[PDB]
Amino acid sequence: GSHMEAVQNRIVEAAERVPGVRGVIHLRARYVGQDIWANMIIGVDPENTVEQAHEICEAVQAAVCGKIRRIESLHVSAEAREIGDTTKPSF
Amino acid sequence: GSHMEAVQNRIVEAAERVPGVRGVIHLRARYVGQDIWANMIIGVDPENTVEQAHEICEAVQAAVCGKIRRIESLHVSAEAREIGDTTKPSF
Numbered sequence: 094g095s096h097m098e099a100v101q102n103r104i105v106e107a108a109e110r111v112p113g114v115r116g117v118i119h120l121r122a123r124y125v126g127q128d129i130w131a132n133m134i135i136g137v138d139p140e141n142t143v144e145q146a147h148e149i150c151e152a153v154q155a156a157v158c159g160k161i162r163r164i165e166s167l168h169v170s171a172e173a174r175e176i177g178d179t180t181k182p183s184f
Numbered sequence: 185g186s187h188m189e190a191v192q193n194r195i196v197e198a199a200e201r202v203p204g205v206r207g208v209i210h211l212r213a214r215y216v217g218q219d220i221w222a223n224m225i226i227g228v229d230p231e232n233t234v235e236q237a238h239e240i241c242e243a244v245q246a247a248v249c250g251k252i253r254r255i256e257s258l259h260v261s262a263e264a265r266e267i268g269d270t271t272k273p274s275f
């Protein structure tokens with residue numbers, strides 16, 4: 094599984110590099126031909142408004158799509174995550 | 185496709201019956217044996233905090249799981265949706 098491991102590692106690394114991201118909670122990706130399609134959920138400050146959270150999703154989209162050009166489609170959305178959360182999964 | 189059509193119709197109807205839901209934006213469901221597994225994204229007020237949005241996700245979970253007992257697992261999260269949004273899909 095190294096091909097998709099390396100892709101998912103790079104997606105997570107790029108998304109955690111965006112300020113406002115509190116970990117990656119869910120991520121699934123797949124190849125379609127040579128291209129990649131992915132769905133991701135990031136953790137964010139629960140006190141952010143949803144509008145504010147979205148601006149983090151858009152930053153993550155930009156960062157990830159920009160660092161990994163084989164990604165043809167990427168959907169990013171958010172869930173709440175408190176600091177020191179052990180209630181949700183993460184990478 | 186009537187079996188899954190009827191299930192998805194019932195999921196959407198039950199979720200839109202929850203105050204705070206601004207449409208169902210994304211929904212995918214499948215059978216695993218006789219049981220159903222689903223992933224849904226609801227629209228919410230962009231001005232809600234993420235914490236507040238989550239309380240809507242938990243209400244939708246409760247409503248949907250309660251009305252459709254063949255659903256064994258259901259993940260609900262949110263995205264922003266302004267009133268009169270034509271920028272995101274919906275059911």
Ligand SMILES: [Zn+2]
Nearest residue numbers: 146147150170
């Ligand atoms: Zn978003």
Ligand SMILES: [Zn+2]
Nearest residue numbers: 147148150151
């Ligand atoms: Zn956007």
Ligand SMILES: [Zn+2]
Nearest residue numbers: 209210225263
């Ligand atoms: Zn979406």
Ligand SMILES: [Zn+2]
Nearest residue numbers: 237238241261
């Ligand atoms: Zn939620």
Ligand SMILES: [Zn+2]
Nearest residue numbers: 238239241242
């Ligand atoms: Zn919850």
Ligand SMILES: [Zn+2]
Nearest residue numbers: 118119134172
């Ligand atoms: Zn989740």
